[PDB]
Design a protein around this ligand. Sequence first.
Ligand code: UTP
Ligand code: MG
Ligand code: MG
Lengths: 251, 50, 277, 1340
Amino acid sequence: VPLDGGRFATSDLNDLYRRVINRNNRLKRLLDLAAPDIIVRNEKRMLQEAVDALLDNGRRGRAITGSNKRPLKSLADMIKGKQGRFRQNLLGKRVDYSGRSVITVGPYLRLHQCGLPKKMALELFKPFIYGKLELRGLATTIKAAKKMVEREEAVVWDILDEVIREHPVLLNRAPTLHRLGIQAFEPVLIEGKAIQLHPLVCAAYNADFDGDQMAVHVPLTLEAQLEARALMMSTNNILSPANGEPIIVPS
Amino acid sequence: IETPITANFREGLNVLQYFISTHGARKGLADTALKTANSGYLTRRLVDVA
Amino acid sequence: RVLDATQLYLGEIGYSPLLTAEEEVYFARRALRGDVASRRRMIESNLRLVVKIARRYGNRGLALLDLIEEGNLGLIRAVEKFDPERGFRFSTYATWWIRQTIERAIMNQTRTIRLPIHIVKELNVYLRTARELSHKLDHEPSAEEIAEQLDKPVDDVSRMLRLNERITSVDTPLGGDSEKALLDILADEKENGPEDTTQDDDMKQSIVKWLFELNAKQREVLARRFGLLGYEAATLEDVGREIGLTRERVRQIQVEGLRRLREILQTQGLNIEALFL
Amino acid sequence: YSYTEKKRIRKDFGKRPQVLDVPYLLSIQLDSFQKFIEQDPEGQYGLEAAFRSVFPIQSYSGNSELQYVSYRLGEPVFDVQECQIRGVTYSAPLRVKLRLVIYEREAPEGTVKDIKEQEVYMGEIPLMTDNGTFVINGTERVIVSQLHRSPGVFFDSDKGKTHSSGKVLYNARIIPYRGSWLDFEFDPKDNLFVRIDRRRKLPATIILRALNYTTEQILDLFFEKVIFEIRDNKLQMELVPERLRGETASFDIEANGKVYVEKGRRITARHIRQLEKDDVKLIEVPVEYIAGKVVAKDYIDESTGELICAANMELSLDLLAKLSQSGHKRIETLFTNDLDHGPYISETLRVDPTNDRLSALVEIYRMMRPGEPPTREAAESLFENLFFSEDRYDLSAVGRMKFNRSLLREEIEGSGILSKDDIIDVMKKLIDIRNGKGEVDDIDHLGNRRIRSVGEMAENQFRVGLVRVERAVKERLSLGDLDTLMPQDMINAKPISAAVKEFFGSSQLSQFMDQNNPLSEITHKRRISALGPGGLTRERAGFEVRDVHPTHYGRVCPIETPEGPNIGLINSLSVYAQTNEYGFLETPYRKVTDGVVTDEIHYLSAIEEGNYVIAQANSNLDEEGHFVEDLVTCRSKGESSLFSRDQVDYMDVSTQQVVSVGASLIPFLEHDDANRALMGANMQRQAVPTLRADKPLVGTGMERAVAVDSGVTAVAKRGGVVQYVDASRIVIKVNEDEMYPGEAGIDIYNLTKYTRSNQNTCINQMPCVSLGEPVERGDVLADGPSTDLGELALGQNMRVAFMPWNGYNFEDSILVSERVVQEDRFTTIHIQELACVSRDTKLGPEEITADIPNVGEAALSKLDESGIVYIGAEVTGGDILVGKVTPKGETQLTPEEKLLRAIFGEKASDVKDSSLRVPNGVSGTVIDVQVFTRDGVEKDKRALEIEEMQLKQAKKDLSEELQILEAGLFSRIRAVLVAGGVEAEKLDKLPRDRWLELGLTDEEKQNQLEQLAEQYDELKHEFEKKLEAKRRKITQGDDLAPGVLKIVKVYLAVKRRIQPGDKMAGRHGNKGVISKINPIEDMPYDENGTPVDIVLNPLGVPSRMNIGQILETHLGMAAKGIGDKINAMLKQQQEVAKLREFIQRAYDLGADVRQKVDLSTFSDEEVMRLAENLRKGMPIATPVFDGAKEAEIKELLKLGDLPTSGQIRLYDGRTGEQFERPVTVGYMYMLKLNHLVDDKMHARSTGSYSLVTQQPLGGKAQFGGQRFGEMEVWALEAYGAAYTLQEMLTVKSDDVNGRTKMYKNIVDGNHQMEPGMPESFNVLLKEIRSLGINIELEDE
DNA sequence: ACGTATGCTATAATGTGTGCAGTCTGACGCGG
DNA sequence: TCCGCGTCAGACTCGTAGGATTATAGCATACGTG
Ligand SMILES: O=c1ccn([C@@H]2O[C@H](COP(=O)(O)OP(=O)(O)OP(=O)(O)O)[C@@H](O)[C@H]2O)c(=O)[nH]1
Ligand SMILES: [Mg+2]
Ligand SMILES: [Mg+2]
């Protein structure tokens, strides 16, 4: 595929494939010439080197290095280990309706509450604004609703505020050690780029307000809203699963 | 060390008392970064079987 | 023993004839007349000559083993067309072939994007002219500075330099440490995300509502012209094929459909709102 | 004291007078490069070395050759000013003279046949600034110094390779600067082996055979000899009394007349002196004793001529009897000892399957090139090429130096190649260590970790350029025609240019240095790393490396290093630390002569530190004499204890040499844990400079040193009166004594005005001097972005109070007043740079016009006709900075668009839109815009308006230069003319253009008038070509990347205010997020009324153990108390004498104050300018370890009429009622870290998608969702929330059906699960099929 | 006709090599 | 079958930062489509 800068970019497979096809076609040419076997031998050894390098480069011998003196990424490599498809592009995923930001204290909040910035929840609940807008009849279509949100007009804040009520959000902190590394709350819109977290559940996350960031996630489906309120709500999660002991102890 | 640190933080460490404090400080914080991976790798190992 | 494909072949050439002047002629004279064994020998013998010529033609496109293979093909074409009757040696004539076959095979399998010889041949003279200039200007020559020495077009020099632009693999580490590649950044052009997908779905469902809200003959004639409901996008003149069969009445009814629809967009809340878009 | 110091003096609580003044910060870097370019005549260094090393190069035949003559540096094409802006390397032309000499073939050496000679360019080398930076593609970058294992020899031992045996196997290793490795190692059976390049393991006698050594010589170089005589019938043996030492008498030991030891008895030291004093030489012995002993030399039968017994063969009874009757009654054997002189080479030869020299070169050749049939030359050439050729091998100076002193040698400087001697000497010391004497070296000692700054590394990379040219020279010379071919046709300039830019770009040491803080710049240039090429790796890095080593003392800082996996490797250099002439580090030390602590200083190497005993700086001098106390706490041999007076040899110079720059700025470091001290110094580097530079009330004194040496300020080259003050520039008139007699003598300093940083922050230089002020040489004229009267000003100090506040300071959370936000004091400035590129696509060229399709008049309001936003125009996310349009190809107008473009009209043209618009979110003020264009296509009208200014502003700027330079030049002539022909007004009648017309009598001053007259003309002619260079470069086309036609670079300047989420900290590692900006109504306040600025959590203190912040607070309060008293007297408008008494009483209070500043010396005017700066608060210096103690701080608090405690009676603002009991209040110098929340927060609903994985991208950079990793996944599995996970695996990530379908369902209100199956898995299926594996989805 | 591709030239020349070498604990898999 | 030595397998989780290559002759008929 071509870059924005007029450059192109190719995967190392294409390069490894051109090594296979060239040598294979050169063998067809030498079998046409009935060349001496000594040469045919080299061609067959080469062909094998290329095939073996295509399947799993760094294994039989030296991995065929390319442009930046680094080894070409082969096929097996895209299925292999951390950097493979399994761990990196299948069990772990970047996810929509997700945002992260510096957290700060929320000593006014109750246990089942957490501060959520307005401009954050704005972008996060984008399809829920367009939905409640068509209902009231303020938007006839969705690109109309898109512009209504963009202009940040006053009455759009009140609609956003409407959908978010009685709607839980997932708050994650890295690293996710135990299940309590994510807990759900009822978002409270606050003007400012900081998330406000409940002091007592700080223990579960191990979240220190020294510049911590927590990922936000919106439960879309009604089942996810029920799951978040039933299982993952902060009030329904008190005791540690490890020990029958309250992890929400004042500190 | 045969000779420990006599002073405290209110009184002030001398130049070495701090140099000595370093040895323990850097190695304690080296095991915060490096040794965490063995324990986090254990979490991974435990999970897969369970 | 030996498990490197390199050293194994390089061993087998090391146990192959090293021909004299009169020997070359004896074999070559029979090789043209087809002795079978003769063509095999002259070739087997001068594999050693191909390797010495491939020791200078490396680090340019393919590997040393890839250069020898294609260098051997040059020695073969040299054997297919050698003149023993001429008093001149073979090693001389074969070198012209082995240097050629290598250069040519590098020019094809070096670049991912197959660059033919014509655009490449010229590029070399532009680059080799840059050498002369660079040494005496002590300044890497511009597209203009190269054009003023050759007295050739500006865009030609520039477009030939555009094809010299090399590639970065999408699987190349960014920052010289396991972090992320270009694929974990570079987005997909073809499919735009749900918001762009639902834009057209909702915009085009709103039009299906606006057409059933127009006239019976006005939404027939307007839709089938643009190819909205019909199968083929016709013109004012071509709407006559269906039932219209008119040139003036089709144009007045097309625009009559659009004028009533322009008031439908002024009232619903678009018109100048959706004009910027 | 100086004038700029007279304006504001810092009270110093130091009691250890500085014998050594802090050196220049930027020194190593500068000196390093100062060696690389330095064209040394003979002592080759840098480039001169690189040429003499590689050159002369000769053809493969050896009939033609290229010889190096001389090289030179041309002045830079583009200077720093220009380079920083355009965006190309600040490099200098490399012109090297080459000489092509060709010989006659049949003739001997016809050297004089064609001595062709010409000058040739090859590559442009990035130069170093005066700051120690390299401008690469418009980025001042720093090449951090590397820390690597020093070449030579090194003895190590895996304390248990096979813990099976648990045997400490000793090994040696010769490390060269260039060349192959040479290792020697034992094994479970103590057989010596050699592994060149750590390849195959070969017996260690095989390498000796290769050096032509017979089995006999090998045994006569390691082991001793045992003389065995067979006299008449009694077998006899020579005894050196000191041999049968610590062994057992296996036989009855009896001499000329006495039995000393009995059978099966230990021979003690008494028995050895018993024998040695009796002068015993010969002893009769049994024949059973030799059974086991090894014969030394060969023994042929005198009679037959055959070997009775070969050298190195265990003797027996029958072999000895065969030798006695052959006719040899003088036998030589080896001295084997299982305890001391060990038999290793002996047992090794029994394993060694080789024979002679030529056969030993075979297995050496069969190791490194296995499979190639070996010849006499191939085997010899290889081995000779390894460690014995001037080409392949080079230990270097350091290599041979360390190599020699490791072997306790004779020479410091010797040969670059390994000699026979060297090899065997190394095997010998390896065997010494194995025996018992000799200790192994350890790598963690800095005596083995050498420092390699840029200049040597630039030299190395420059060699590879020459090596890659060597190839092209030789091959073109031999086969190419001799005569025709010129030397530059064979040279290529790209391989050198590419190999050097490889270093100045891709290298791990070559990176961008922080510039958001003077401390960041200076500490990042003083960074030293072990990583990148020729070093270590996080993957490879151990513990013992990282750990602080007692060698670091005075050399490297114990508390300066990232707390990330790159923790112990990266390290800043110590304050007074400097590089050894060879490479190691060295630290200053006060020599003690005959007890007298002399002021003579000696920089002791890492090696010699261990030798002498070194007293600490805590030790007390007797005011010119010696140590006051008899006992002195000192340190040596890497240990510490008390010693006597005469035993002390050296002493620490200052008390700050242990620490770095980063740590020398922390006050009361002595009262801070090393863990929090590290973080404090790490965050002090992240301190973004504020709007108004506020000086620190609680400093150390190092403040000025940093600000000045950073090269961010503008300090005076020559002292005199400031003729002119201006915001843009400074003009100073030089005094007669300093001013040169030739030139005019008026220095020019055009101050760098507001422009961008590498971290997108403000860079300004404001004049810190008044119009017409007398300034001394080396005084700060303009302050930098984070400096104040020359002293460093990183953050701002404020009244702080330690107490909790309704949990708004929970876990280190910060509660800041609105009054701080009102003063806009923590309001930092951000300078972003958005660029706009006109490219050449396949369809056609792009341009830059105001004509943009589908646009609001609102967007094109801030743009001009050319299509660039006005200077000073405010912009916001969505507004367009620079209008761009690209070509639009075959476009399928969809029926719904063809109708919509036919309804409202506005038919778009054949051109696409891609205008550079302010990124969604950012908002600031455009401060400047710069336009770069190729040399061709006609320009925009705005590009012409900007050319108008540059030109007419340059014409003015140069007019001003020649004008004021004229006035300063005639000012001299006017003074010269008076001396001789004294006439005042009559001379000043007619104009000044006819002054060179007037002269003087035959005098030195007549020659002076001619100098100034023809120098005035020299400037008059110079002015034109100065104008030419400006004019041309303003109309010249800058060279761009292929495809690019022109670029427009925009500079924004946002003013971000502090807000909840912003991260701030002290310098004691006390971190915190601002949680709430409290109303001024609600802020706590003292009985007197003034409120508190920040309210910190007291619980962020005990567990942290960083009590330095509390002392910073207390002193800050005291310091302010004094400013509050001075502020009151200056407001009251009292008197000069009253201020003088109080301020003199303030400066003089400390026990032994270092500075004794008398104010009777200060004039009345000088006192009032001082007091006016002291009113904000008397700035105090607390040296790192020689800081102020409670006695001094509490005494200062009594002067300020402040409480001894430091706790004040506080009242709650919300209420008005007092808090239940006192709280510490004072002024703590806090900082505003770069981690601002506007640059952090992110949100996403749906946006871009990945290329193959088809999951969203990553980061707010590209607008990407948060990653939900496997750990994040297991959490939901644990809860049981199954859809919440499946939702985050499919619709929120890949599932192409799901994501769009779900979107449409949400806007409908029906939040319904609609899964399908992520794309990333459908990829995995085909990927396994592409690997030749049948993987199909087997159905129900 | 325009672009791509194939072809020939004749002093003699006949066996490559290059490049990071404090990672490490743990676990098999062929010989010996 | 058992003990040494070779190759081959992993390495806590999320955020941010930035850049650049060398060279393949020279000219004359052969092969593919508007
Ligand atoms: O490499 C690191 C270092 C630290 N951390 C995490 O960051 C936090 C730093 O340490 P904290 O400041 O959270 O410490 P603490 O509350 O457990 O104890 P005190 O300070 O009160 O004595 C801890 O929660 C630790 O797990 C990491 O996740 N990784
Ligand atoms: Mg934290
Ligand atoms: Mg904490």
